């Protein structure tokens, strides 16, 4: 438990609570040249985390970078922080795009599962995997910074750009 | 025992995708001297500032390297950077070295703070001391970091460039 629940807070301390503030200004500002307004955050129970989405999905295309945040922190000058837009096809056709990535905290645990110092059990990384969403949907859900600027996507494993494509139409 | 998972976060997620790339951009920088090795601030107490010539003027920043890009989890092309540091000493330039704090301490700090986190502002020593630990067994038994890389774990009461001064001049 505690692994997963410290993941789930450096997700929110090290990234959520950074860039979700700034998230609205830099996709308005993508918009002005050129609901879609959230991050969608892919959380795979199985810590299955490809850096490539296209691979996850053909459907899932990447189409163009987010106006890049960037901030010293922790003695490195200017930390880049930047996000991907995505565009979800359906049958061939462009059914939305969005800004759209996993969860890289669910990779580590993946990772720790396989290495032997960590001591960490292949069949715990199902078991801290739910532990982390549900540390990461009770941060959120207090969270100030977050408000109708992020939704989280978990799912077990099929179509990856159906299951985004279903909470895009839900609301 | 919350530093055990950022110990490895730190490793996977940073130290095992910047060292093996960091001698070859140390490479182009001097070309277009640095040290070849990623030198860690890793303060005890968990203040970790984010502008390093606050905690110390002899501490300066001089120049960022070549960025590294990739991937990673459905994100085109993460930025990876890294700055370089000069080291004074009686107004004199006495070294010069790829500096940084290491970010997760700063999280264990933050973690404190937050009152839902569940993590005691009196567990920031240890969990630090755990971090530590922990990264040093990490990067032992680790090829990846095969002397591209070595910890600076301090307490303090002081000198911050003198100490990395110390582990700096400890390689010449
Ligand atoms: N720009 C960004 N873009 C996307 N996503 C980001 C992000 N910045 C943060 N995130 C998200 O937030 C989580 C926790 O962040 P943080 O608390 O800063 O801990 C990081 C450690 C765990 O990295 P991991 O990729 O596993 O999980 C991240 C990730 F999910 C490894 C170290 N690290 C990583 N990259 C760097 C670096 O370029 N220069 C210095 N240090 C670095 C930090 O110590």
Not at 3 to 17: C, D, E, M, T
Not at 51 to 62: E, G, Q, T, V, Y
Not at 134 to 140: A, K, P, V
Request: aromatic share 10%; proline share 4%.
């Amino acid at each position: 438990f505690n692994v997963a629940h410290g993941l789930a807070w450096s997700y929110y301390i090290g990234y959520l609570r950074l860039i979700l503030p700034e998230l609205q200004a830099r996709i308005r500002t993508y918009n002005q040249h050129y609901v879609s307004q959230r991050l969608y955050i892919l959380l795979p129970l199985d810590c299955g985390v490809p850096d490539n989405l296209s691979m996850a999905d053909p459907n899932i295309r990447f189409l163009d970078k987010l106006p890049q945040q960037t901030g010293d922190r922790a003695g490195i000058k200017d930390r880049v922080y930047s996000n991907s837009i995505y565009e979800l096809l359906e049958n061939g056709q462009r059914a939305g795009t969005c800004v759209l990535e996993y969860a890289t905290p669910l990779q580590t645990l993946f990772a720790m599962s396989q290495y032997s110092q960590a001591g960490f059990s292949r069949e715990d990384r199902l078991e801290q995997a739910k532990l982390f969403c549900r540390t990461l949907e009770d941060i959120l859900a207090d969270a100030p910074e977050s408000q109708n600027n992020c939704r989280l996507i978990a799912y077990q494993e099929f179509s990856l750009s159906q299951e985004v494509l279903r909470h895009l139409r839900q609301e």
